[PDB]
């Protein structure tokens, strides 16, 4: 949905908040990136979880 | 904690306002009074007795 003649452009992006990005409105920090203590950081997700790669296998 | 009085005056230092520049460390910004924290409010008013025999603290110095 973005006009670009390169096939997939770069660095696949996540989502954030609902505001204007400058022009003072006290942007919350917890809303910007969406990784709390949960199954969303990949190293805590590998032991919650308990995949085989945390055991060396 | 403190009770400031400013008589104007004044040849003294607490009436001397903020200089626009600081060119060297012997021409620092002059201030009326400083207060180190939280070690001023913990000593004063008998708050030292009621947090003796504890170890850790959170606080917001109002």
């Amino acid at each position: 949905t973005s006009e670009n003649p390169k096939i997939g452009p770069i660095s696949e992006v996540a989502s954030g908040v609902k505001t204007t990005a400058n022009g003072i409105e006290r942007i919350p920090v917890i809303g910007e990136i969406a990784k709390p203590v949960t199954t969303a950081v990949k190293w805590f997700a590998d032991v919650v979880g308990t995949v085989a790669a945390i055991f060396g296998w | 904690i403190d009770n400031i009085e400013i008589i104007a005056g004044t040849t003294a230092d607490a009436n001397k306002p903020l200089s626009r520049y600081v060119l060297d460390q012997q021409n620092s910004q002059k201030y009326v009074r400083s207060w180190t924290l939280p070690s001023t409010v913990l000593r004063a008013g008998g708050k030292a007795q009621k947090l003796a025999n504890f170890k850790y603290l959170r606080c917001d110095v109002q």
């Binding site: 204007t20 990005a21 400058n22 022009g23 | 520049y21 600081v22």
Partner: protein, 208 residues
């Protein structure tokens, strides 16, 4: 018309033209092609902190022999933006561009280790995660120090508690000379804003 000072602030805007957020977006489609919103993203771009970092052969050198000199200067973005803030958090990245008149009759390699902050070279071991490059084939030594801290944030110039978070140690078999360019990693940020210091202009050395 009573006596006494008052309040009730009168926000006035000159030039009733057009809402500015439309004019800014229309001015960056024609002059930039990019829209720099946040200053955190300038901590992820590598800016060079030195141009000639001369070292000796067989000498374990911490980066705090260089970083402690260039934090005060404010040249790059991590040392210029640090004067607005009081804390930081997260790891740091480094790149070591080679500028040595190398010989072919030796095999130069570049080791890199971890020390905790502000230790010397003799009071730490070399048994940790490392990285080795060869400047004859790979002239850029790219390394990332993580955030291995006892505290959730680090102040500036703390107490005699030293070695509470990790840093980098440099090693090379030959006397090299490099271009160091640092940036923060994907978790690096400042915080707890204060006001800015002064700036410095030119130095003409005038005739009288």
């Amino acid at each position: 018309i009573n006596i006494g000072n008052k309040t009730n602030e009168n926000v006035i805007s000159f030039f009733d033209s057009t809402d500015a957020e439309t004019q800014n977006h229309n001015a960056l489609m024609k002059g930039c092609g990019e829209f720099i919103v946040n200053l955190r993203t300038l901590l992820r771009t590598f800016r060079t902190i030195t141009d000639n970092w001369i070292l000796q052969a067989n000498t374990k050198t911490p980066i705090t022999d260089l970083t402690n000199t260039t934090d005060a200067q404010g040249r790059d973005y991590m040392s210029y933006l640090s004067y607005l803030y009081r804390f930081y958090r997260g790891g740091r990245r480094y790149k070591f561009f080679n500028t040595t008149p190398l010989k072919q009759s030796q095999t130069c390699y570049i080791r890199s280790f971890l020390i905790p902050r502000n230790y010397s070279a003799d009071e730490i071991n070399v048994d940790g995660p490392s990285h080795i490059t060869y400047p004859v084939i790979n002239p850029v030594h790219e390394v990332e120090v993580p955030f291995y801290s006892q505290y959730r944030k680090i102040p500036i110039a703390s107490t005699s508690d030293k070695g509470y978070d990790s840093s980098l140690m440099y090693f090379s078999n030959t006397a090299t000379t490099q271009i160091v360019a640092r940036a923060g990693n994907d978790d690096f940020t400042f915080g707890w804003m204060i006001g800015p210091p002064q700036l410095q202009g030119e130095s003409r050395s005038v005739a009288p």
